[PDB]
Amino acid sequence: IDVFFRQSWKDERLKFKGPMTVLRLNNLMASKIWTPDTFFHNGKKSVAHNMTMPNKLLRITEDGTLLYTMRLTVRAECPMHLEDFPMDAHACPLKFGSYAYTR
Amino acid sequence: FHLKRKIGYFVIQTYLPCIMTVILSQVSFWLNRESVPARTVFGVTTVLTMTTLSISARNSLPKVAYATAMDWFIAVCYAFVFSALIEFATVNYFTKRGYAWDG
Amino acid sequence: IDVFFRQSWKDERLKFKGPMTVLRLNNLMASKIWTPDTFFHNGKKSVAHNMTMPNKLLRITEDGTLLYTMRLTVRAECPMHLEDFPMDAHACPLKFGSYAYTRAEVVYEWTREPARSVVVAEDGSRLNQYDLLGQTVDSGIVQSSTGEYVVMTTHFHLKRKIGYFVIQTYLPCIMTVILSQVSFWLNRESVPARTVFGVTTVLTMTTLSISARNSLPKVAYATAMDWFIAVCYAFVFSALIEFATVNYFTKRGYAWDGKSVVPEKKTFNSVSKIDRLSRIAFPLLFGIFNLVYWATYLNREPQL
Amino acid sequence: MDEHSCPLEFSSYGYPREEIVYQWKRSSVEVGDTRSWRLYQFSFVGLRNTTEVVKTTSGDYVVMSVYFDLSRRMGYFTIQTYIPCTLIVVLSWVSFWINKDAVPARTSLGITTVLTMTTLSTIARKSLPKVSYVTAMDLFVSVCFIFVFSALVEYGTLHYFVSNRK
Amino acid sequence: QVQLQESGGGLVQGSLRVSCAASGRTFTTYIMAWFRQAPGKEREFLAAMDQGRIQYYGDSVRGRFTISRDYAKNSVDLQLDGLRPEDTAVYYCAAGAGFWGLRTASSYHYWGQGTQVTVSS
Amino acid sequence: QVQLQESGGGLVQGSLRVSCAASGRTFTTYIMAWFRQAPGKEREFLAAMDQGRIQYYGDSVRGRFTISRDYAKNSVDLQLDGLRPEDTAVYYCAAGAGFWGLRTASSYHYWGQGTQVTVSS
Amino acid sequence: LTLDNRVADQLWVPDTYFLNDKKSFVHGVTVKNRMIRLHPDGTVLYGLRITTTAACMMDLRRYPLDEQNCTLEIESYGYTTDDIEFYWRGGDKAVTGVERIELPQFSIVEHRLVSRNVVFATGAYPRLSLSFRLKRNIGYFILQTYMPSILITILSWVSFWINYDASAARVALGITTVLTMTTINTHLRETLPKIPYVKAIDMYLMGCFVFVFLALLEYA
Amino acid sequence: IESYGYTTDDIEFYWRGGDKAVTGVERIELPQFSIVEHRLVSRNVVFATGAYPRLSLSFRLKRNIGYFILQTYMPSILITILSWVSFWINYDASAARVALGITTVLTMTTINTHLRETLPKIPYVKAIDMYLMGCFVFVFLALLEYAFVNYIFFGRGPQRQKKLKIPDLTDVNAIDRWSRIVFPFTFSLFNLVYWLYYV
Amino acid sequence: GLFHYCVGSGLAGRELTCRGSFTDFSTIPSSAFKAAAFFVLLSMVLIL
Ligand SMILES: *[C@@H]1O[C@H](CO)[C@@H](O[C@@H]2O[C@H](CO)[C@@H](O[C@@H]3O[C@H](CO[C@H]4O[C@H](CO)[C@@H](O)[C@H](O[C@H]5O[C@H](CO)[C@@H](O)[C@H](O)[C@@H]5O)[C@@H]4O)[C@@H](O)[C@H](O[C@H]4O[C@H](CO)[C@@H](O)[C@H](O)[C@@H]4O)[C@@H]3O)[C@H](O)[C@H]2NC(C)=O)[C@H](O)[C@H]1NC(C)=O
Ligand SMILES: *[C@@H]1O[C@H](CO)[C@@H](O[C@@H]2O[C@H](CO)[C@@H](O[C@@H]3O[C@H](CO[C@H]4O[C@H](CO)[C@@H](O)[C@H](O[C@H]5O[C@H](CO)[C@@H](O)[C@H](O)[C@@H]5O)[C@@H]4O)[C@@H](O)[C@H](O[C@H]4O[C@H](CO)[C@@H](O)[C@H](O)[C@@H]4O)[C@@H]3O)[C@H](O)[C@H]2NC(C)=O)[C@H](O)[C@H]1NC(C)=O
Ligand SMILES: CCCCCCCC/C=C/CCCCCCCC(=O)O[C@H](COC(=O)CCCCCCCCCCCCCCC)COP(=O)(O)OC[C@@H](O)CO
Ligand SMILES: CCCCCCCC/C=C/CCCCCCCC(=O)O[C@H](COC(=O)CCCCCCCCCCCCCCC)COP(=O)(O)OC[C@@H](O)CO
Ligand SMILES: CCCCCCCC/C=C\CCCCCCCC(=O)O[C@H](COC(=O)CCCCCCCCCCCCCCC)COP(=O)(O)OC[C@@H](O)CO
Ligand SMILES: CCCCCCCC(=O)OC[C@H](COP(=O)(O)O[C@@H]1[C@H](O)[C@H](O)[C@@H](OP(=O)(O)O)[C@H](OP(=O)(O)O)[C@H]1O)OC(=O)CCCCCCC
Ligand SMILES: CCCCCCCCCCCC(=O)OC[C@H](COP(=O)([O-])O)OC(=O)CCCCCCCCCCC
Ligand SMILES: CCCCCCCCCCCC(=O)OC[C@H](COP(=O)([O-])O)OC(=O)CCCCCCCCCCC
Ligand SMILES: *[C@@H]1O[C@H](CO)[C@@H](O[C@@H]2O[C@H](CO)[C@@H](O)[C@H](O)[C@H]2NC(C)=O)[C@H](O)[C@H]1NC(C)=O
Ligand SMILES: CCCCCCCCCCCCCCCC(=O)O
Ligand SMILES: CCCCCCCCCCCCCCCC(=O)O
Ligand SMILES: CCCCCCCCCCCCCCCC
Ligand SMILES: CCCCCCCCCC
Ligand SMILES: CCCCCCCCCC
Ligand SMILES: CCCCCCCCCC
Ligand SMILES: CCCCCCCCCC
Ligand SMILES: CCCCCC
Ligand SMILES: CCCCCC
Ligand SMILES: CCCCCC
Ligand SMILES: CCCCCC
Ligand SMILES: [Cl-]
Ligand SMILES: [Cl-]
Secondary structure: OEEEEEEEEEOHHHOOOOOOOEEEEOHHHHHHOOOOOEEEOOEOOOEEOOOOOOOEEEEEEOOOEEEEEEEEEOOEOOOOOOOOOOOOEEEOOOOEEEOOOOO | OEEEOOOHHHHHHHHHHHHHHHHHHHHHHHOOOOOHHHHHHHHHHHHHHHHHHHHHHOOOOOOOOOOOHHHHHHHHHHHHHHHHHHHHHHHHHHOOOOOOOOO | OEEEEEEEEEOHHHOOOOOOOEEEEOOHHHHOOOOOOEEEOOEOOOEEOOOOOOOEEEEEEOOOEEEEEEEEEOOEOOOOOHHHOOOOEEEEEEEEEEOOOOOOOOOOOOOOOOOOOOOOOOOOOOOOOEEEEEEEEEEEEEEOOOOEEEEEEEEEEEEEOOHHHHHHHHHHHHHHHHHHHHHHHOOOOOHHHHHHHHHHHHHHHHHHHHHHOOOOOOOOOOOHHHHHHHHHHHHHHHHHHHHHHHHHOOOOOOOOOOOOOOOOOOOOOOOOHHHHHHHHHHHHHHHHHHHHHHHHHHOOOOOO | OOEEEEEEEEOOOOOOOOOOOOOOOOOOOOOOOHHHOOOOOEEEEEEEEEEEEEEOOOOEEEEEEEEEEEEEOOHHHHHHHHHHHHHHHHHHHHHHHOOOOOHHHHHHHHHHHHHHHHHHHHHHOOOOOOOOOOOHHHHHHHHHHHHHHHHHHHHHHHHHHHHHOO | OOOEEEEOOOEEOOEEEEEEEEOOOOOOOOEEEEEEEEOOOEEEEEEEEOOOOOEEEOOOOOOOOEEEEEOOOOEEEEEEEOOOHHHOEEEEEEEEOOOOOOOOHHHOOEEOOOEEEEEOO | OOEEEEEOOOEEOOEEEEEEEEEOOOOOOOEEEEEEEOOOOOOEEEEEEOOOOEEEEOHHHOOOOEEEEEOOOOEEEEEEEOOOHHHOEEEEEEEEOOOOOOOOHHHOOEEOOOEEEEEOO | OEEOHHHHHOOOOOOEEEOOEEEEEEOOOEOOOEEEEEOOOOOEEEEEOEEEEEOOOOOOOOOOOOEEEEEEEEEEOOOOOOOOOOOOOOHHHOOOOOOOOOOOOEEEEEEEEEEEEEEEOOEEEEEEEEEEEEEEOOHHHHHHHHHHHHHHHHHHHHHHHOOOOOHHHHHHHHHHHHHHHHHHHHHHHOOOOOOOOOOHHHHHHHHHHHHHHHHHHHHO | OEOOOOOOOOOOOOOOOHHHOOOOOOOOOOOOEEEEEEEEEEEEEEEOOEEEEEEEEEEEEEEOOHHHHHHHHHHHHHHHHHHHHHHHOOOOOHHHHHHHHHHHHHHHHHHHHHHOOOOOOOOOOOHHHHHHHHHHHHHHHHHHHHHHHHHHHHHHHHHHHHHOOOOOOOOHHHHHHHHHHHHHHHHHHHHHHHHHHHO | OOOOEEEEOOOOOOOEEEEOEOOEHHHOOOHHHHHHHHHHHHHHHHHO
8 A cells, every 4th residue: 555644743842933834844854853653563564665865744833733744655464354255355454553652 | 444356357267167167068968878988078078177277266365274165166066067977977877789879 | 797897097186105006995995085977878777796895896006096896796688689589699788888977077998908808707607598609899979868978888699599499399399290290190980089189289289389488578570489380380280171171071980891802993981092192291391391491590690 | 284393593693691691581472363363374383482502603692492383274285186186086986987898988088087187296296395205295196196097007907808809 | 153152240339341252263353342232222332352452442431441352262351340320231242354344233243142231329 | 671761962072961761670679870882892880879879980980970860760860071082982771780790791681772972072 | 067976965856756656766886876967057957867667557458459558657745836846848858768669568659748736635746747658569469369269269160070970079179179268268367467357358268269169069 | 705805915715614614514404405515615716906815615416306206207107108008909999099199198298398397498408308208209109109000900901901029010919019018118228228327 | 113213302301302204215214114114014005
């Protein structure tokens, strides 16, 4: 599955006042700030696209609201019932969450 | 994500060959009982065709250790073909003379 | 192709005076100085080996001359004309040049005379179905949207070895044709047997034709092997049609019995003159076709 | 009908036992829904944990191993090999009920059964590596060949002694 | 035949545990869930547990009832805490693949007898 | 039948442009070259262009003659500049796969009829 | 100033990406096939040698007599139309080298360049589209599938010229023709995906199968 | 193993521990091969850029024959033996004998073709190819033998009657008996020569 | 037995490692063992 995966969150440290309300910045600064460590529980060798540049975007609003989007191709598990095959139907999950941070 | 398999491929590709093989096996009942090599050819070729179809049907799936609906269909069609061959065997057992009607 | 690709150039900024004239330095120095941005025009996906370390060497002479060698594995495009397949031969290029610098900035020359500036190891051949007759070395210019670039080219001349396809396709086809022609020698009243000959040989020819082009690209035009298979299939089809014609003229459903005497024209069928003529015609025509085919396809390519 | 105990060993690459030592916690290896995994051809029986000291040139290292027991599920191979081979053997048996005067019929039946058994033999070993020893499947398919061959030889002998010799 | 057999108390004044065991199937890949019927004939999803050990809970009973699964024993347990008089109802155990569902009763093809629970103040 | 038709002027006192159009076979993947046979001498390679638009030239005519290819029209052109009296010769168009060659006439399977060029002082 | 390609890491460049990309890379032998050229007026030319595998969903209903539209969708990831504006430099001559492409199985009927703006929840972004129309060659399939089917169907009619009482011969001929058609369909299996609809080649093979089956039924 | 940048004036290589430098060879399990020997060599190699040190670690592998005996040799032998069955079938059973011969011939053809779809496109003949062509020649000769007796009978008997150590070519029974004797003996001789040559 | 043999590791416990199989004659310890196994098989074949 090819996805634009968007995550947004508040960060009081990154508040600012300037000519424009939103700074649409290069994705390289995303490595210099905290971002959530989201991962796919049932994923299997996903790839973050990097052609030509890393397919990410970061935007900081004046009030410290960050938007952070990634382009991914996620390969995820989908256990199957093959007893009704080829009349079978499935519900393939896509489950994601933080790796290091608890509830 | 809820997905439903499309049966059209397998209908075109496995079910129709099996049905036509069964019909071809049943065609032999309409030949005269003295055409022993011809009816034997019918039965033997249909049995081997069903065996080949059974072998080739499982290539799509992973090697699961249970029977699918396609497997049950192939098994029933194999039973029909083998029953046709046994029927010819009985007919030949009860055939007396080795020559057909002269016309 | 696996190559030690080595370049050399003078950098006046890197001259030095010291105890030893040539500094055989670690390859880490290569990243710290300017080096040519050479790339392969027809390369597909190449590898610069770095096991255990980067397989490179840099040497700086006191006068400022630099030698810079790399170990490379280049898989490159070799467009092929398969009209004469398997009797075909190709000239696979290897073209390289600067990616960024035009002819007005960077120019490539050969270290020695161009013939001797590309050396192949004696033991260095991994060709299974090809024979490397030699190579020719040349250089030229290419015009692009960015500018003019010097392109240094080699062309490796390869000739396909025919033995694999001879064993895989030609001999089974020939044996199938001979097997089909064997049916002419059976009595005309063996209708099921001769039909079995015809149908089984047609099946074998169809299977061979279907599986012949497994290894090739899906080219539109027909190859020499395709023509050979088509002619052999025509021979088998003609043999079966010949049996059908013979059977159409058979009057009596019983063959000759070992005891009776055939009068010279209970009666018996005579040996079909179609069969008698076919016994000579079919093998002779197949042999003549083989003669013409192998005469006109084995010697087609250029020679030195 | 084979069972295997597949290992997973780990240790310290550079630090020998005098520098790093590994220990299994009280809850060493945890599993979730074991029988929902991708073990299509295998069934997970259990697992166990071991610790050992392994000598090398660099030194002695503490290697910790986790063995997983996997028992093969035979249903796929039952569908693939055992049932077709048995059915071809029964097909060969059907020749005995055909009239012995039906020479082309019985000969064709026997030779076609021997062809289909060769085909099934070669398809049987596609899933396995190219091991150079007999397996249970090879033995079964091999005995099925003798049965289909013996049937053809039986008809050949009967025909020769009934008609050709006399 | 397959049965989803339940166990658990019926009378409380507290805390309770309702277990539900299953057997007789090679089939495993099912979400296992609990549903509630109060007087009035309406099914109410309470909790569910995935093959990935992920637990889904209804908004009404979030933080109160906790679901767990013993995969080796092929059972699902529901620990009920903070019971109140409005919780009196009959509880059904369901197991099935969540197709178009995981919160609607129609997606589960196996159901049990059900167990009553009542709260008296 | 495959044909390589050549066009261009015949007499000049100067600059010239000689064109060659192919028919019956697309030579997109082939290599298209120009040769020159003077009265009483052997054919001499002038220029060639590959499928990769890479240009090769002979030393005698390097920097003077310019070879180009129109791949849509399946044609090869040669612009001749700085003509001199010893350029008088028959100019031939060739197309082929360069086996053992790109500079030898034997590597080219298809040839044009040839067009005369004369330079008069 | 044609600078060393490592200065691209120091300079700003557009965050261009191909939306329908599956797997792509910049060639990295002998170095990264990348180019940076600065001009006195501050103009930057940034070149890359890229090999990309792009998704193309192909309708095979008329296969192998079908034409396919395969596109590359160049887009800016993080910069909306308020920040970046793409265009095809040189107009319709922006893309070159299509005429020199010679696929063994396809012919490029034409190619098109399109420029538009695509809207997402995050904003509106510029989009360039390089489309190719590819027409499939038929000679390979004529050699591989159609001609054997025609020849088998023609052979199936030989039974009509055999006497009615030659049951073994006629039944052998019919059964063998049916088996050979199934074998041709086996080879058609082995080189295609699992599409759910019938193709033109499937229609032809089913028709030939019906013909040989009807010949056998005629003898019966 | 070789040094890339450093010549023998800069770097020298040796096998530490001598012949015991390489370990773990005896614990290698290859399904198709058995490691009969391993060898260590130290030498110098001269390129255009200078002389460099070289260490060579070589293994000799002997292929296991049992898999091939199971998969190829035994089915070929069995198909040839069943090809010989037609010699005992009556000469007038033309459909039966032709079906047997054709089936055996095509079985050999299919085995030979499908075996070499898991190997590189080498141009030369392998030992397995020699064996398979031998079996093909034997089954083809059996089919031609039936063709010969059928032709002799049905194309010489009439005019031969009207005109009124190999055996006489006038008796199909004699030809069949000669084939019965000679085909097994010749096939056994071929197998003996093949195995003694290649082992 | 004739082909299969189990031996302990020798650490005051069972730890029986087992090796041998008639299907794999390489694992049989001796040619005499192979011959005995073959003869007992032949007897099995005859009685069956
Ligand atoms: C391969 O297959 C693909 C997929 O089908 C083909 O792709 C499409 O190609 C066509 C042209 O061949 C494209 O249409 C052109 O699009 C441009 C750009 O459109 C953008 O800009 C417009 C102006 O700013 C804007 O209006 C557009 O948005 C909409 O409004 C218009 C007008 O109502 C409407 O028609 C659109 O559908 C949009 O809803 C868009 O943002 C456009 O400028 C072109 O107009 C030209 O055409 C008009 C006649 O319609 C003509 O009068 C003009 O003079 C001018 O010539 C034209 O519409 C289309 O965008 C492509 N779609 C995609 C998804 O790529 C491709 O062509 C095939 N190639 C081959 C080789 O087979
Ligand atoms: C697998 O396949 C590979 C490839 O074929 C086999 O590799 C070869 O193995 C043999 C050993 O079995 C190697 O030969 C040995 O090489 C060493 C080292 O030689 C180098 O160094 C010497 C000094 O230490 C030097 O003298 C050598 O000089 C060469 O040139 C001179 C020219 O006069 C010649 O006389 C030498 O013989 C060398 O060829 C060289 O630079 C060498 O020390 C060994 O000597 C043995 O034999 C001599 C008598 O000949 C004896 O006096 C010594 O005491 C010693 O017993 C020997 O020559 C060979 O180099 C390998 N080839 C390659 C290319 O690697 C491998 O063996 C196969 N093995 C398996 C397991 O199947
Ligand atoms: C060797 C091979 C020879 C073959 C030659 C045969 C020639 C003669 C037959 C031609 C048949 C034409 C091809 C079949 C049609 C192509 C198959 C097809 O697409 O049908 C689909 C529905 O199928 C379905 O209903 C599924 C069920 C179909 C099952 C039909 C089989 C009936 C057999 C009854 C037995 C009678 C026996 C005679 C006994 C007297 C379409 O649906 P829909 O788009 O909505 O997508 C919904 C989603 O399921 C994807 O399709
Ligand atoms: C009366 C009836 C009359 C009918 C008329 C019949 C017509 C008779 C003509 C036939 C055409 C023969 C094909 C001739 C093709 C020419 C082939 C040839 O030149 O011979 C060598 C190849 O041999 C080879 O690989 C290998 C040759 C193999 C020969 C095997 C003989 C066995 C015969 C048993 C049959 C088994 C079939 C079983 C198949 C299933 C060349 O190698 P060379 O050194 O140059 O370099 C290696 C090479 O690969 C470089 O290209
Ligand atoms: C073949 C299929 C088609 C035809 C079938 C016809 C029937 C034939 C019968 C059985 C199979 C034939 C024998 C095949 C034996 C297996 C092949 C063989 O002979 O090879 C040798 C013995 O291998 C081994 O372990 C095998 C040893 C045991 C072999 C025999 C097992 C029992 C067979 C009981 C039969 C009862 C029948 C009853 C009928 C009623 C080993 O060499 P190799 O260099 O690899 O060693 C190096 C080493 O390191 C390999 O690991
Ligand atoms: C390679 C082809 C060479 C053709 C050589 C053709 C040579 C030629 O002259 O034709 C002979 C052939 C029939 O000859 P054929 O040997 O099959 O039939 C015998 C004989 O020719 C008479 O038909 C009968 O004699 P009569 O009437 O009772 O006195 C005799 O009856 P009987 O003795 O059993 O009682 C028959 O056995 O005729 C065609 O089929 C034309 C189409 C041939 C098309 C061939 C298509 C391959
Ligand atoms: C390019 C090479 C071309 C060579 C020509 C083809 C070779 C065969 C031509 C037949 C020559 C011939 O007529 O004499 C064969 C003899 C006597 O024949 P007849 O003239 O008395 O009818 O009759 C016999 O006794 C021969 C017995 C044959 C028995 C059947 C096996 C041969 C099958 C041949 C398969 C092609
Ligand atoms: C009945 C047998 C008679 C034999 C006569 C002598 C054989 C004549 C042709 C032999 C094969 C041959 O050289 O054909 C080459 C051509 C391909 O041409 P090219 O690609 O080599 O230029 O390939 C083809 O296009 C095949 C053409 C047909 C070959 C078979 C001969 C057909 C004779 C009758 C034609 C109506
Ligand atoms: C893996 O090894 C550890 C070693 O400590 C085992 O841990 C003990 O397990 C028992 C039984 O559960 C507990 O009573 C002990 O408290 C655990 N720790 C210690 C320090 O002994 C563990 O059980 C093993 N896991 C297995 C065998 O699956
Ligand atoms: C499409 C191929 C069908 C096969 C047709 C086989 C025809 C064999 C019979 C030919 C009969 C020739 C005409 C008989 C009358 C005569 O010639 O005197
Ligand atoms: C006179 C009889 C002619 C018979 C030959 C033609 C048979 C054509 C194949 C059957 C039609 C199949 C149509 C499938 C349409 C679909 O995709 O649903
Ligand atoms: C690579 C060179 C090959 C040289 C030709 C080899 C021909 C081998 C033919 C073997 C045919 C089997 C003969 C069996 C005799 C009973
Ligand atoms: C339950 C096993 C069924 C195996 C396939 C069908 C056999 C039919 C025999 C007549
Ligand atoms: C096998 C496809 C090529 C067929 C060539 C023409 C055969 C003519 C048969 C009479
Ligand atoms: C290398 C080709 C040798 C010549 C083969 C000619 C075969 C003709 C047989 C009649
Ligand atoms: C003729 C029966 C087979 C003979 C095989 C010879 C094997 C020799 C091994 C040294
Ligand atoms: C099941 C076989 C049926 C036989 C009819 C007599
Ligand atoms: C190619 C077929 C030849 C037929 C001779 C009668
Ligand atoms: C004549 C076509 C076949 C008829 C089958 C009843
Ligand atoms: C003419 C072929 C004879 C085969 C051996 C008797
Ligand atoms: Cl190769
Ligand atoms: Cl054992």
